[PDB]
Amino acid sequence: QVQLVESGGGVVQPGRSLRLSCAASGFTFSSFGMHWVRQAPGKGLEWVAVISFDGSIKYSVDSVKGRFTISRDNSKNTLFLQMNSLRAEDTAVYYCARDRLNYYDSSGYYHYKYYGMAVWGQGTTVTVSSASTKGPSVFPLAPSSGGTAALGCLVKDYFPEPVTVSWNSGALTSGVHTFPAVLQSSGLYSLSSVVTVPSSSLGTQTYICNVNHKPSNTKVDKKVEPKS
Amino acid sequence: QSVLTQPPSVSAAPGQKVTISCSGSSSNIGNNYVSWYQQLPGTAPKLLIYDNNKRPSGIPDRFSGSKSGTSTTLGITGLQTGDEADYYCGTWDSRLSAVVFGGGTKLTVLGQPKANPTVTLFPPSSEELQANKATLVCLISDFYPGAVTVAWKADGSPVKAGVETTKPSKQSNNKYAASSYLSLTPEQWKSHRSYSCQVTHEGSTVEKTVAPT
């Protein structure tokens, strides 16, 4: 019954803004200090900001001062983070988190007092990059050269994530390996998918990789045939 | 880099206990309560310990916390595979006026047997060459532990330009995968007799080669 539901993530270019929401349920929202914490892909947790139970006291990390604004609406059990003038280094999963102890403890005479977090949201992804929406080029990777053959699709130069790949419209699943994308210096992604099949099937079965990049409305079913 | 120093990794075998340190200064751990959070792959963090050594409702006997002045220690006994995760210490810092987290300690549970990588290397496709691009694709799967080094060679000489390589990622079968891409012009693809992808894992190397002809 006690949870936090984040929304408002997205993909943007540098200099743009974004607003995150954290809808709270299960507890008296108005009695707890709230935080935002972020995690860049593959790195540690970085605290972003805190706001006191009643909104009067706020702190944030220097790198977001003047850019990000933590606020809350107690009458609607929601925590906000207004993100302006975004930079590539703001790219991360953003979590809201609730103080373990309520204002009985966290509202001192002098200060807001921190004793740990207890409840975390699921997170929302913010991606900041110079790149523009671009659909992939899809290239067949043909088999050649024991009684097994490997064939694939190269899904090249797309932005943003994600892309889904399947084979023969989901009918072919054994021997399928789809690899996480590489992020190139250009800001574009590429990925590949491979399937190992019996060599003896190559003249009686057709192999088609189904590539869907929803953000660019790109859907391609690419036939992969023996080379000649 | 971080204000609190945690070891980047530790490991022990199923059933053993392991220890994870978190070092700080008087303005954080010295004067404030430390919590420890566990993060499993693709999930939010979860509170393990608060007030230095307390376990919240539902966190089992196996986890514990100690404080020795400006340092703190997490203890995990009777290790289970499901304890594989990143562990973070956190606290308030009086000087910075911020919650501060250690960098993270990746916990590995031993026992899982070594697995050598399968390497698959594709040349540039006809279609890609026609669009005046060229990409060599090197796919690396089913290896454990989850670290490899990739090196490309053309006619025996190293190739550093145009190489982009992903970090390893965990497959669902608990082994790891990775991939490396070499971009060339069609001219420089045709100008060499061979290109080769060399994947080194625990000191051993697996090589595949492709050629225009």
Do B87 and B170 lie in one domain? The reply is no
Measure A74 CA to nearest chain B CA, in Å. Answer: 23
- Report the distance separating Cα B90 and Cα B3, nearest Å: 10
DSSP assignment string, B12-66: E-TT--EEEEEE--IIIIITS--EEEEE-TTS--EEEEBTTTBPPTT--TTEEEE
Distance in angstroms (rounded) separating the CA atoms of residues A121 and B131: 46
Tell whether B1 is covered by a domain.
no
Distance from CA of A52 to the nearest CA of B (A): 13
Nearest CB to A150; choose among B39, B120, B125: B120
The answer to whether the Cβ–Cβ distance between A227 and B126 falls below 8 Å is yes
Q: Is the same domain home to B30 and B122? A: no
* Residue B4 maps to a domain: no
What residue in A sits closest to B93 (Cα-Cα)? A114
Are residue B17 and residue B105 in the same domain, yes or no? yes
* Cβ atoms within 10 Å of B136's Cβ, excluding its own: 23
In angstroms, the separation between the Cα of residue B43 and the nearest Cα of chain A is 7
CB pair distance less than 8 Å for B50 and A100: yes
Burial-class residue B135 by CB neighbours within 10 Å (0-12, 13-18, 19+): buried
On whether both B105 and B123 belong to a single domain, the answer is no
| CATH number assigned to the domain comprising residue B14 | 2.60.40.10
Mark which of B74, B109, B144 sits at the end of a domain.
B109
With contacts defined as CB-CB under 8 Å, which chain A residues touch B39?
45
Query: Hey, what are A76's tokens?
Result: 């609607």
For residue B195, CA distances in Å to A80, A141, B124, B126, B206 come to 53, 16, 11, 17, 14
Interface residues of chain A, partner chain B, Cβ below 8 Å: 35, 37, 42, 44-47, 50, 59, 61, 95, 100, 113-118, 120-123, 137, 139-142, 150, 152, 154, 156, 177, 179-185, 190-192, 194, 227
Same domain, yes or no, for B27 and B101? yes
DSSP secondary structure of A55-121: SS-EEE-GGGTTTEEEEEEGGGTEEEEEE-S--GGG-EEEEEEEESS-HHHHB-SSSB----EEEE-
Taking the C-alpha atoms of residue B206 and residue B158, their distance in angstroms, rounded to an integer, is: 16
Of B32, B50, B88, the CB nearest to A44: B88
Domain span at B153: 118-210
- CA angle (B100 as vertex; B95, B101 as ends), nearest 5: 155
Q: Name the closest residue on chain B to residue A60, using Cα atoms.
A: B98
Residues of A in contact with B164 (CB under 8 A): 182-185
Q: Are residues B14 and B102 in the same domain?
A: yes
- In this structure, what token pair is assigned to residue A78? 């929601």
Q: Which residues of A67-100 are buried (b: 16+ CB within 10 A; e: fewer)?
A: ebbbebeeeebbbbbebeebeeebbbbbbbbbbb
Q: What is the nearest CA distance from B164 to chain A, expressed in angstroms?
A: 7
Token pair recorded at residue A98 = 């609730």
How many degrees, rounded to 5, is the angle at CA A129 between CA A49 and CA A38? Answer: 25
Name the helix (H) or strand (E) containing B129: helix B126-130
Q: Do A177 and B139 touch (CB under 8 A)?
A: yes
Q: Which of B47, B103, B179 sits opposite A117 (nearest CB)?
A: B47
Give resolution, Å, one decimal: 2.4
Question: Which two structure tokens, joined as six digits, stand for A219?
Answer: 């859907």
Size of interface A-B (CB pairs under 8 A): 120
Shared domain for B105 and B125, answered yes or no, is no
CB contact under 8 A, B135 and A156: yes
Q: Is B19 a member of any domain?
A: yes
Burial group, residue A126, by CB count within 10 angstroms (0-12, 13-18, 19+): buried
- Domains A3-128 and A137-224 in one fold: yes
Instruction: For residues B202 and A62, give the distance between their C-alpha atoms in angstroms, rounded to a whole number.
Output: 42
Name the residue among A123, A180, A184 with its Cβ closest to that of B44.
Answer: A123
Q: Are residues B14 and B105 in the same domain?
A: yes
CATH 2.60.40.10 fits A137-224, yes or no: yes
Query: Do B30 and B99 reside in the same domain of the chain?
Result: yes
Residue B142 lies inside a defined structural domain of this protein: yes
**Architecture in CATH of A3-128:** Sandwich (2.60)
Instruction: Verify that B179 and B196 share a domain, yes or no.
Output: yes
CB contact under 8 A, A142 and B97: no
Structural domain count, chain B? 2
Please answer whether residues A216 and A134 qualify as being in contact, where contact means their C-beta atoms are separated by less than 8 angstroms: yes
Task: Report CB contact under 8 Å: B44, A100.
Answer: no
- How many Å lie between the alpha carbon of B168 and the closest alpha carbon of chain A? 9
Name the 3-class secondary structure at A25. strand
Nearest to A141 among B44, B102, B125 (CB): B125
Listed in order, strand segments (DSSP E) in B105-194 are 105-109, 118-122, 134-143, 149-154, 157-159, 163-165, 169-170, 176-184
* In a domain? residue B3: no
In a domain, B81, yes or no: yes
In a domain, B169, yes or no: yes
The strand pair at A124-128 and A10-12 is best described as parallel
* Residue A142, C-beta contacts closer than 8 angstroms, at least 6 positions apart: A151, A224, A225, A226, A227, B122, B125
Please report where in the chains the tokens 């190293």 appear, as a residue. B158
List Cα–Cα distances, A215 to A9, A11, A135, A139, A158, in angstroms.
15, 11, 8, 20, 10
Q: Are residues B145 and B190 in the same domain?
A: yes
Note whether B103 and B168 are same-domain residues. no
Tell me which of B96, B125, B129, B184 to substitute to probe the interface with A (most A C-beta atoms closer than 10 Å): B125
Q: What separation in angstroms does the CA of B204 have from each of A114, A118, B207?
A: 50, 45, 10
What is the distance between the alpha carbons of residues B180 and B136, in angstroms, rounded to a whole number?
Answer: 8
Strand B105-109 and strand B9-12: the pairing is: parallel
First to last CA, chain A: 62
A152: which chain B residues are within 8 Å (Cβ-Cβ)? 120, 122, 137, 139
Determine contact, residues B121/B140, Cβ cutoff 8 Å.
no
Report CA torsion sign: A114, A116, A118, A122. positive
| Calpha distance B98→B105 (Å, rounded) | 21
DSSP state of B130: H
Beta-ladder partners of B46? B38
Q: Domain limits of chain A?
A: 3-128, 137-224
Q: How far apart are CA A48 and CA B100, in angstroms?
A: 10
Give backbone dihedrals phi and psi of B105, rounded to 5 degrees, phi first.
Answer: -120, 120
Residues of chain A neighbouring B180 (CB-CB closer than 8 A)? 182
Q: Is B97 within 8 Å of A37 when comparing Cβ atoms? A: no
Query: Which residue type does A73 have?
Result: D
Give the span between the Cα atoms of B116 and B201, in whole angstroms. Answer: 7
Q: Which residues of chain A neighbour B169 with C-beta distances below 8 Å?
A: 180
